[PDB]
Design a protein around this ligand. Structure first.
Ligand SMILES: Cc1c(C(=O)C2=C(O)CCCC2=O)ccc2c1c(=O)n(-c1ccccc1)c(=O)n2C
Ligand SMILES: Cc1c(C(=O)C2=C(O)CCCC2=O)ccc2c1c(=O)n(-c1ccccc1)c(=O)n2C
Ligand SMILES: [Co+2]
Ligand SMILES: [Co+2]
Lengths: 381, 381
């Protein structure tokens, strides 16, 4: 059931901003490993004396990487005279975020009809303000509220290319990489307590709980009206045999934050072939693959959706498969993106729920906790 | 003239340590862009709760990338009980270094006969101590003194694989990249005042001035007995037409530090082909190439050392060429390695001075300041 209780008009995920120590090196690594092109920049060469920000794109997916310069370069500036292209940026906040959490997501940005309105309504409904609405070149409005931990939910709205003050990157510096990733499907937070986290965010957005079907977690999913913005949230379950990966996150991340970004591919097989070719030459590594019993067990579960060849292709690439009552999910998880066992990426593709495909078709793979366990025991034979 | 006045026995450059915000992402980028394999690690998976350190190698060149974890992971430790593999590491120092300078070199490490002796003698001769000699697993001794700014000169000596507590990386995670780079030729510091910098370092090492032949700089080179350890130092020259690149460095770096690392290739043509193929897919960009007049002018200067084809190959790759009285130098410079216009890399190959090749054969390319200027004017025709 979907009560369509959004308190302001939400369109789509717009972008994800990483706060880095060196934006250049993270962005170049992510570009190669994920097949995203360099699309826009705001840095010293564009007149920004405050921060370096580089934008990667693949389809509609937008990854922004930002790091502070020396405060000495902009010491004479004040907010009215700032050269920063993202007015919510603050040197002290960025250094404190990164020193506290390491590399990770600072902003989950969604496009809305009116960012000023979304901010006002959100704050009126319990949101903790983080950066007030600011109109950029009379063209774009951006505002931020706290989501969980030091992660903010960023609203962006356009009167009518990324943001004013960003320049389109030189054609020669912009190699057209593409491994098939097309948009952000969902963005997941880890928190110590799921209940209060859910009440707060659903409180100020109006997002409704998205319907699901000892793994170390309890989780729930918040969703916008058309269920295209999906924000799952996890809490640990303690006292378990194997230590909870949610708890390990909170420990190494110094508290709550974004756990994983799930990127939808138009062809998960090609995406995984391309990413795995690059794992040991600068790209991303993947979780260890399930045993062959897991793939033997796929004939019975989804043998009506995937052929034997497509199931064998899943096995070659370590892909996981789960199923709802409305659709099927193909998924795989990377190892952590940086030094700490905190943030990782999920690659996904959804089959079914055609009307356009409805959001969350096939779920989020919680069925794969059971099947991975049974599979491991099966293989132990 | 070489008075061979070293105050302790120095062997070779051993390694360069970068202090990073996220060592994983910098190391993966450098590996792909320079063609260096992952050779050793010390991180959570090896029991190091203090820092993540990853070692890349190409031939004898050793790049170490280190970043701190949350201090909370090791809050119960004391130096006697440390899990750090590099006992000189300090969370506060590393965060302060990186927040002050951004990505750059923390340690220039040289192998010596006896690191304890080199430390004692250095300090007795004016060196500012930074980390006292510490014996690792009764096998390796490491000690550090200040070089310039927040850069240290690290001494390492072995009784008899990188350092104790480092593990050799998994074969599958260690792809055998190699674009022909083989060793560190020289490591260059930028300082506000060359005179005091030279007197200090030559004071405590015994290194002698290495013989040279409005570019924005004055420079001098310090060298060990066999002139295989080469430490050039630059200071700005002010009041010039075009602003001094040494001054821009000092401003953006918040003071003195390492300007460039020069990496010797066994085949600079292949190295530059391989690096340029990767510039826009995660690797490194190069300075804009000299005009064709520069290469037309190469026939007269070095036409007895390089064929017409080799000169044309230099022109295809943007390589610079300079000449001593004893040898010839092929060189090219990358754009800055990270966000700030501070540290960059030089690729070089030296021709001549065969006895083994003697160090610094052909110089450091200061002749290319003149030739680049004349070339630009020539081309302006
Ligand atoms: C993160 C994840 C998801 C996932 O995306 C996700 C959502 O989108 C929102 C709902 C909660 C949730 O979990 C699905 C299945 C996973 C995992 C996962 O992390 N692990 C795992 C655990 C410990 C070590 C290695 C892997 C799994 O085993 N399964 C089977
Ligand atoms: C750094 C460099 C070197 C070099 O390696 C080096 C040493 O090893 C030690 C002695 C001093 C020194 O300079 C040689 C020649 C260079 C440059 C250089 O930086 N530039 C440059 C300047 C401004 C913008 C872009 C490039 C040059 O034009 N030349 C021609
Ligand atoms: Co997910
Ligand atoms: Co040089």
């Amino acid at each position: 059931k979907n009560p369509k209780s959004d308190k302001f008009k939400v369109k789509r995920f717009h972008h994800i901003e990483f706060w880095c120590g060196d934006a250049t090196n993270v962005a170049r690594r992510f570009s190669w490993g994920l097949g995203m092109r360099f699309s826009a920049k705001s840095d010293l060469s564009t007149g920004n004396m405050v921060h370096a920000s580089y934008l990667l794109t693949s389809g509609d997916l937008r990854f922004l990487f930002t790091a502070p310069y020396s405060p000495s370069l902009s010491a004479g500036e004040i907010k009215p005279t700032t050269t920063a292209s993202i007015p919510s940026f603050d040197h002290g906040s960025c250094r404190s975020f990164f020193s506290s959490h390491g590399l990770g997501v600072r902003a989950v940005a969604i496009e809305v009809e009116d960012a000023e309105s979304a901010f006002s309504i959100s704050v009126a409904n319990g949101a903790i303000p983080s950066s007030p609405p600011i109109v950029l070149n009379e063209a774009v409005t951006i505002a931020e509220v706290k989501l969980y931990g030091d992660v903010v939910l960023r609203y962006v709205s356009y009167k009518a290319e990324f943001l004013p003050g960003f320049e389109r990157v030189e054609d020669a510096s912009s190699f057209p990489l593409d491994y098939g990733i097309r948009r952000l499907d969902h963005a997941v937070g880890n928190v110590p307590e799921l209940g209060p986290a859910l009440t707060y965010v659903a409180g100020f957005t109006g997002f409704h709980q998205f319907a699901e079907f000892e793994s170390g977690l309890n989780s729930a999913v918040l969703a916008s009206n058309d269920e295209m913005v999906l924000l799952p949230i996890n809490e640990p379950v303690h006292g378990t045999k194997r230590k909870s990966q949610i708890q390990t996150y909170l420990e190494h991340n110094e508290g709550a934050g974004l756990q994983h970004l799930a990127l939808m591919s138009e062809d998960i097989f090609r995406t995984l072939r391309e990413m795995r070719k690059r794992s040991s030459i600068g790209g991303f590594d993947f979780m260890p693959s399930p045993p062959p019993t897991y793939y033997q067990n796929l004939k019975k579960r989804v043998g009506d959706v995937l052929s034997d060849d497509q199931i064998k292709e899943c096995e070659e690439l370590g892909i996981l498969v789960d199923r709802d009552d409305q659709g099927t999910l193909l998924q795989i998880f990377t190892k952590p993106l940086g030094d700490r066992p905190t943030i990782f990426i999920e690659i996904i593709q959804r089959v079914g729920c055609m009307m356009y495909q409805s959001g969350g078709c096939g779920g989020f793979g919680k069925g794969n906790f059971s099947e991975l366990f049974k599979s491991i025991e099966e293989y132990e034979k």
